[PDB]
């Protein structure tokens, strides 16, 4: 390895403060994204599931819930401080990885119903929170990506058009 301490200081800080800032805007209400025919709704440390329906931006709520469309993508924890996260990066920028586990074992292969969530900045100076895309990556694993303005405050997560 050949790296200085400031480099690690900001890497570590970015992971820490990024998560705390995510939780601060998500605290407001849940987020939702219509991925073609399916809708994925993520809440501030409650659960992550996919249901059919529509949303009225005016009110910010779905048409009605759905007890027949049983789905589970993963269940987070209220004690976010205890949950460990990771700081990876891509050609676009750095991001925080949130693996939401506590899923059932998929009989297909014998793997957990967890999901990988990536927190990226949307290159926006303001706004609430929204998702970009969400889909199945493995037999029992899904991948989801959100774009929020507040992550751009962290130098490493700061998009070039913040």
Tokens of 21: 């800032």
Q: What size, in residues, is the chain?
A: 162
Tokens of 146: 């959100």
Per domain, the residue ranges of the chain are 1-162
Report yes or no: 8 and 79 within 8 Å, Cβ to Cβ: no
Q: 146 vs 12, 21, 139, 141, CA distance in Å?
A: 21, 13, 22, 17
CA angle 65, 71, 73 (to 5 degrees): 115
Q: Is 99 helix (H, G, I), strand (E, B) or coil?
A: strand
Report yes or no: 39 and 51 within 8 Å, Cβ to Cβ: yes
Q: Is 87 helix (H, G, I), strand (E, B) or coil?
A: strand
- Give the Cα separation of 140 and 158 in Å (integer): 32
The neighbouring-strand residues paired with 155 are: none
CA quadruple 23, 40, 75, 135: dihedral sign: negative
Q: 73 CB contacts (<8 Å, ≥6 apart)?
A: 40, 48, 49, 50, 100, 103, 113, 115, 142, 144
Distance of CA 7 to the CA centre of its chain: 25
- Give the Cα separation of 34 and 96 in Å (integer): 23
Q: 142 CB contacts (<8 Å, ≥6 apart)?
A: 73, 115, 116, 134, 135, 136
Report yes or no: 120 and 112 within 8 Å, Cβ to Cβ: no
Sheet arrangement for strand 94-100: 86-89, 94-100, 115-121, 142-148, 130-136
- Give the Cα separation of 72 and 69 in Å (integer): 10
Residue among 162, 149, 152 at smallest CA distance from 25: 149
- Give the Cα separation of 90 and 79 in Å (integer): 28
Residue among 90, 81, 75, 97 at smallest CA distance from 144: 97
């Amino acid at each position: 390895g050949a790296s200085n301490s400031e480099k690690t200081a900001l890497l570590t800080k970015t992971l820490n403060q990024g998560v705390k800032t995510i939780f601060d805007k998500l605290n407001e209400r849940c987020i939702f994204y219509q991925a073609g025919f399916w809708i994925y709704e993520y809440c501030p440390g409650i659960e992550f599931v996919q249901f059919h329906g529509r949303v009225n931006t005016k009110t910010g709520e779905i048409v009605n819930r759905d007890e027949s469309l049983v789905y589970r993508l993963g269940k987070p924890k209220a004690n976010v401080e205890e949950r460990e996260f990771e700081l990876l990066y891509d050609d676009v920028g750095y991001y925080i990885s949130e693996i939401i586990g506590s899923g059932d074992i998929c009989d297909v292969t014998g793997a957990e119903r967890m999901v990988e969530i990536q927190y990226v900045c949307g290159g926006s100076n303001s706004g609430p929170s929204t998702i970009q895309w969400v889909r199945e990556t493995k037999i029992c694993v899904y991948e989801a990506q959100v774009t929020i303005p507040e992550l751009c405050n962290l130098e490493l997560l700061a998009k070039n058009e913040d």
